[PDB]
């Protein structure tokens, strides 16, 4: 479905909510629709770390 939220993903994967929100803002994605958005967010998070 399209009910995945940033907070749920951050809690599940063990990241910090602030980092996930900032990565989502930077990557230009506002909704986690497909795997591409998640991949982009994770790439931004990894580069930042």
């Amino acid at each position: 479905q399209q009910t995945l939220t940033a907070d749920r993903l951050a809690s599940v994967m063990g990241l910090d909510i602030s980092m996930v929100t900032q990565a989502m803002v930077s990557a230009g994605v506002n909704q986690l629709q497909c795997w591409q958005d998640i991949n982009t967010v994770l790439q931004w998070i990894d580069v930042a770390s």
Binding site: T3, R8, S11, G14
Partner: protein, 49 residues
């Protein structure tokens, strides 16, 4: 000091019992996804008849 002793005792127990902090968090957290899971759907489908 009570909080410090509690943290020390809990961490020692977790290290001795070979349980990661994430596992204990999943065991004792009060938060939940709030979305019905495929396991629950299968349980309901098998239980209704």
């Amino acid at each position: 000091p009570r909080l410090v002793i509690w943290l020390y005792q809990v961490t020692q127990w977790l290290t001795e019992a070979e349980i990661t902090t994430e596992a204990i968090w999943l065991l004792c957290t009060p938060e939940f996804s709030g979305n019905i899971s495929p396991e629950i759907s299968n349980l309901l489908n098998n239980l209704r008849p």
